[PDB]
Design a protein around this ligand. Structure first.
Ligand code: YQ2
Ligand code: 1LT
Lengths: 144, 1012
């Protein structure tokens, strides 16, 4: 009973710890799914901003070429370049989070694997301990 | 989805005082604009358009008034910002960027939908995106309740809306337990009526002595009588003057927003009866009705934008369900041998036939393609029939003894909300096994697919019968149903059976017994829960006969109809009777008292649209005091993904029709968000900083303009009758606890704040589940109501506690109260952090010296007795000088009830509570008025009689408390997951014993917990 209760109280402590990591990891996974959802909506907005920019620049680049105002065309190009710098910086942020989500979502499956092998074993140890059931030594042997 | 944090940006709690914001202009240009974190959108758009002139194509931009901002929020929402008064830090943007667009849609309509999405904690647009017809049907069809409730509010304008906004807070009984009557001077109470004479806040009082059962107009008329008597009016002119004027004034409580708007006796109003208990003279404010009616804004309720069959009984076939395959399961093939799907057809918790399991398959290949044949005839399927299934892993590595373990589970209603038998293929995303669930099936868990589609997905297939199968109409069931053994032996047994608690086993004979005598059960209506469990729900014949018996069943008391709403009684007709009992007997007072349980049991309804949610919505929409806590209790559990859609869809409807109170809630919700975010910082990033650095940071932050506007001028969520004005910032502090609680103090903006309290003190705590303390304080309040009705003046103190979200909530501060330890810290130390036993009485002797001494010791010993019994019955252990407080007036009360019902000792298997009450001696000294031989006094004997008398009183009402806990099962509270957790109350109340064996049992436990 001392041997079986100590075996019981350890796996009890490990299943609890693993369940903490499991649920904690689960909340984190949801947030990464959220931020990827938010990144997708943000990327969608920036890509529209690029498409609309090409429409308006179209006739002005044509105008500023003929009017010899090459210096203004560099303004539009410089800002358009500044846009694409921001978009690439953001796609990289989403990509790193997508990669990060893959590691945690795989680790997550790994926690649930370890518990689901400990979960049935933990019940049996209660059975063996309970077979041993049928005062200082009783509270002592129960890990105290 | 909802927000992960309360931070001003994703992953950042505090925006920098200045932050660069990407501005995407409509001409295609992008402009980086440095903005103040507290800057409004009005300012930011203005500064952008100044900067935009420096950029190409700037002459293409219209005026800044023709554009509005759109961005991505932390909830992944593409939100347009019409209300440009909002500060930058409070938009809760994902990334600091704003796109400039031309506004599309209705301004007022979009601003509302953002306020609602904010209040719910979930973007409204998501409900617009759910393809589920039951959801779209709920959203539309529930508006009937909203409009109907709104018309009932505008029926008797303006008094009807004054009743809605400021409902009378009255006891359920006008009767005074006579020990309260004798606290009056022969049933008369002295009241001070105040009137403010413009403009200097000139406060004139008229003190009156009048009967306790005087109605407000009689109190008013007496005030007018006192005022007008000195003006030599004729006797008849005075009569005419009183009669005319009395109807045009109203009374308000000094210092808070509670009005005496209804014909209740004055003592029935909760403020007055409390004044009798505490012996304080009520201070009331007399006010002209027009002055109040002008303060009432017009509630604009606007209709939102979205506003061949075969009978089940003709199917000559048994029920069969096809288990096709699961996507995946997380098992290590090396340790788990095979897997299978375990199924069962349930009505509530009771199985309707033998559980059926699939064949075993390899772990890596979860596909069964197996038709499971069940032991139930399809016409015999009850309406609340549910498939309860789970994927179970089996490993036989311990010998010939196999290990069976649940991996993931899911329950489904076999009939949808349209009374249709489920048909065809269906995919069910499973739920994880609860922590500690060892059962192979989980029928008490929520039914329906997991909204998280990234979980193991089990594919099912239901039978097809060449036509849509519908549950028969009620007329057919009744008609089909229509097609002196009662001696005292049976009459005495029927009464004994009904008195047994809900957790007592009902044997198979007794099930047969009640069913045979189902008609005499009508003659004893309270037996209905017991009889309902005795029906063969797997037999349409018995169910039909039961339906007919229910259709004419006598209405039962509210406290007994609530049991028929928990997870045990899923049948809609049973619940329909229960709701109708509530419409008939549940006072708005008692509804407020049971509002938590009535929100919890919503989780066990089969469908979104049901009689209970409609009754609760109507009540919430016609009484704002009910509607307030209806909101928060629904709100505080939106974090729970098991119900967030149901509560989300409901909170949408309440917010859309509650009127001007939504605005007050937005102030409260946002005020809490600042507190959560601030505490997050203090708990996370600044966790290692000293008290001084955090206090500096605290004073630094609340002083910021966004913080000042958010945390000032709103209604206390603990009690909206308290107005929270300006912060008394010098009194705000972070408390020493490691959870970083926030002691907050506001000014009371009431003109009579000095007569009630000019300071409102609230403890904000982020990091602890308060649902336990909520429930305990609720239970403590009910025990006191029982003790008072039986004449036991046991002064409890169920102070305010409200969980507002995931482990975050508020606590009402009790002024002039101190923990036993804080009182003990007077003359030096004794031992390893211990203190002197006589110091408590010595302190109390100084506070209440002279004639008040006997009243204080009496108030102490009465208050001590109630908590002693209450903490024993509820199993709240670990009571010591740190969680027992005493007021200067002498009232004792307990605090911090984080864990009850002996769940800390459940892991040990040793059910024996013998912790000595550490403060036995200290409290004995007070009860014994300072005797050296404290246990020898007659006062101690009186103290023991109170506890014996109080203990049996609660034992007499054990069914109510067992039901209250039973209604809380779906909450996910750790100490309250199964009826077995609730069973601890059965032991402490000794329900298996007699009243004599129980009181002896109590006396024993007290002696085992005697001297500390
Ligand atoms: C003065 C005083 C005395 C006692 C105990 C020691 N005695 C009694 C109290 C009632 C009736 C009879 C007796 C008796 O022993 O005959 C006591 N308390 C105060 C408490 O405040 C709390 C408390 N427990 C007990 C255990 C669960 C927590 C609460 N017990
Ligand atoms: C109802 C109540 N009244 C109080 N009173 C003071 O703190 N007082 C009372 C006056 C001064 C101050 C003090 N010095 O002592 S504490 C309190 C309370 C009740 C229940 N739980 C709490 C917690 C768990 C949230 C706490 F304290 F740990 F955060 C507090």
């Amino acid at each position: 009973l001392h041997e079986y209760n100590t075996q019981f109280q350890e796996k009890s402590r490990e299943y609890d710890r693993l369940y903490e990591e499991y649920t904690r990891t689960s909340q984190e996974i949801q947030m990464k799914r959220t931020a990827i959802e938010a990144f997708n909506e943000t990327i969608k907005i920036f890509e529209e901003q690029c498409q609309t920019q090409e429409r308006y620049s179209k006739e002005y680049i044509e105008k500023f070429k003929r009017e010899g105002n090459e210096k203004e065309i560099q303004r539009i190009m410089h800002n358009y370049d500044k846009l694409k710098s921001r978009i690439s910086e953001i796609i990289d942020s989403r990509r790193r989070l997508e990669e990060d989500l893959k590691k945690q979502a795989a680790e997550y499956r790994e926690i649930d694997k370890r518990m689901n092998s400990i979960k049935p074993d933990l019940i049996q140890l209660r059975k063996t301990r309970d077979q041993y059931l049928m005062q200082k030594k009783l509270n002592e042997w129960l890990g105290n | 989805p909802p927000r992960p944090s309360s931070g001003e940006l994703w992953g950042i709690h505090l925006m920098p005082p200045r932050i660069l914001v990407e501005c995407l202009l409509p001409n295609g240009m992008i402009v980086t604009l440095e903005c103040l974190r507290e800057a409004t959108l009005i300012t930011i758009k203005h500064e952008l358009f100044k900067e935009a002139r420096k950029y190409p194509l700037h002459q293409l931009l219209q005026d800044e008034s023709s554009y509005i901002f759109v961005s991505v929020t932390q909830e992944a929402e593409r939100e347009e910002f019409f209300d440009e008064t909002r500060r930058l830090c409070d938009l809760r943007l994902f990334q600091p960027f704003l796109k400039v667009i031309e506004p599309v849609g209705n301004r007022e309509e979009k601003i509302l939908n953002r306020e609602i999405g904010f209040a719910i904690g979930m973007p409204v647009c998501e409900f617009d995106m759910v393809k589920d017809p039951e959801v779209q049907d709920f959203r539309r069809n529930i508006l009937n309740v909203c409009k109907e409730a709104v018309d009932l509010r505008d029926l008797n304008s303006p008094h009807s809306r004054a009743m809605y906004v400021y409902p009378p807070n009255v006891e359920s009984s006008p009767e005074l337990p006579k020990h309260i009557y004798n606290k009056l001077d022969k049933g008369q109470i002295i009241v001070v009526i105040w009137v403010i004479v413009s403009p200097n806040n000139d406060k004139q009082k008229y003190t009156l002595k009048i009967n306790h059962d005087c109605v407000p107009e009689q109190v008013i008329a007496e005030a007018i009588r006192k005022k007008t008597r000195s003006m030599l009016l004729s006797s008849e002119q005075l009569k005419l003057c009183v009669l005319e004027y009395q109807g045009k004034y109203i009374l308000k409580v000094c210092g808070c927003d509670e009005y005496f708007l209804e014909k209740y006796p004055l003592s029935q109003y909760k403020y007055i009866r409390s004044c009798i208990m505490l012996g304080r003279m009520p201070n009331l404010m007399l006010m002209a009705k027009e002055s109040l009616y002008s303060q009432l804004p017009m509630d604009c309720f606007t209709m939102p934008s979205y506003s061949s069959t075969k009978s089940l009984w003709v199917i000559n076939s048994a029920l069969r369900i096809k288990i096709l395959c699961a996507t995946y399961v997380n098992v290590n093939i090396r340790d788990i041998d095979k897997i299978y799907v375990r199924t069962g057809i349930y009505h509530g918790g009771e199985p309707l036939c033998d559980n059926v399991n699939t064949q075993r398959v390899p772990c890596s290949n979860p596909r069964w393609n197996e038709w499971l044949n069940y032991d139930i005839y399809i016409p015999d399927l009850p309406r609340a029939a549910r498939l309860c299934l789970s994927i179970c892993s089996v490993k036989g590595r311990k010998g010939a003894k196999e290990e069976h373990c649940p991996l993931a589970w899911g329950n489904i209603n076999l009939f949808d909300y349209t009374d249709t038998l489920v048909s065809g293929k269906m995919a069910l995303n499973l739920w994880p096994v609860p922590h500690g669930l060892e059962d192979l099936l989980n029928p008490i868990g929520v039914t329906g697919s997991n909204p998280n589609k990234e979980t193991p997905c089990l594919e099912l297939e239901f039978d097809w019968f060449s036509s849509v199968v519908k549950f028969p109409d009620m007329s057919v069931i009744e008609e089909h149903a229509n097609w002196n053994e009662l001696r005292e032996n049976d009459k005495e047994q029927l009464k004994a059976i009904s008195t047994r608690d809900p957790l007592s086993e009902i044997t198979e004979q007794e099930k047969d017994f009640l069913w045979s005598h189902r008609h005499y059960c009508v003659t004893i209506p309270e037996i209905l829960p017991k009889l309902l469990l005795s029906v063969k729900w797997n037999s349409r014949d018995e169910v039909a006969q039961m339906y007919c018996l229910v259709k004419d069943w006598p209405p039962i008391k509210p406290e007994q109809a609530m049991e028929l709403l928990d997870c045990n009684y899923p049948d809609p007709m049973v619940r329909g009777f229960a709701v109708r009992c509530l419409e008939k007997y549940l006072t708005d007072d008692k509804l407020s008292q049971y509002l938590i349980q009535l929100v919890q049991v919503l989780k066990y309804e089969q469908y979104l649209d049901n009689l209970l949610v409609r009754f609760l919505l109507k009540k919430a929409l016609t009484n704002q005091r009910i509607g307030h806590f209806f909101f928060w209790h629904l709100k505080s559990e939106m974090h729970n993904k098991t119900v967030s859609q149901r509560f989300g869809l409901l909170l949408e409807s309440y917010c859309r029709a509650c009127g001007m109170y939504l605005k007050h809630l937005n102030r409260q919700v946002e005020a809490m968000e600042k507190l959560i975010n601030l505490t997050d910082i203090l708990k996370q990033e600044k966790k290692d900083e000293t008290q001084k650095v955090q206090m500096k940071f605290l004073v630094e932050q609340m002083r910021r303009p966004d913080f000042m506007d958010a945390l000032q001028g709103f209604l206390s969520p603990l009690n909206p009758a308290h107005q929270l004005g300006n912060l008394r910032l010098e009194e705000c502090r972070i408390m020493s606890s490691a959870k970083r609680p926030l002691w907050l103090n506001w000014e009371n903006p009431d003109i009579m704040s000095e007569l009630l309290f000019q300071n409102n003190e609230i403890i904000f705590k982020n990091g602890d589940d308060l649902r336990q303390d909520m429930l305990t304080l609720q239970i403590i309040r009910i025990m006191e109501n029982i003790w008072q009705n039986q004449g036991l003046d046991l002064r409890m103190l169920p102070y305010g506690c409200l969980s507002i979200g995931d482990c975050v909530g508020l606590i009402e501060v009790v002024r002039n109260s101190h923990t036993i330890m804080q009182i003990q810290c007077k003359g030096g130390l004794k031992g390893a952090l211990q203190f002197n036993s006589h110091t408590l009485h010595q302190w109390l002797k100084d506070k209440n010296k002279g004639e008040i001494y006997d009243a204080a010791i009496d108030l102490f010993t009465r208050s001590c007795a109630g908590y002693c019994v209450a903490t024993f019955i509820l199993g709240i252990g670990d009571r010591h000088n740190s969680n027992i407080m005493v007021k200067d007036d002498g009232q004792l009360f307990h605090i911090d009830f984080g864990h009850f019902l002996d769940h800390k000792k459940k892991k040990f298997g040793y059910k024996r509570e013998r912790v000595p009450f550490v403060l036995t001696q200290d409290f004995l000294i007070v009860i014994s008025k300072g005797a050296q031989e404290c246990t020898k006094t007659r006062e101690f004997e009186r103290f023991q009689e109170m506890c014996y008398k109080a203990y049996l009183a609660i034992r007499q009402h054990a069914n109510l408390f067992i039901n209250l806990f039973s209604m809380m099962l779906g909450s996910g509270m750790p100490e309250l997951q199964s009826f077995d957790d609730i069973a601890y109350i059965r032991k402490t109340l000794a329900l298996d014993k007699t009243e004599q064996e129980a009181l002896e049992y109590f006396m024993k436990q007290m002696n085992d917990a005697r001297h500390g």
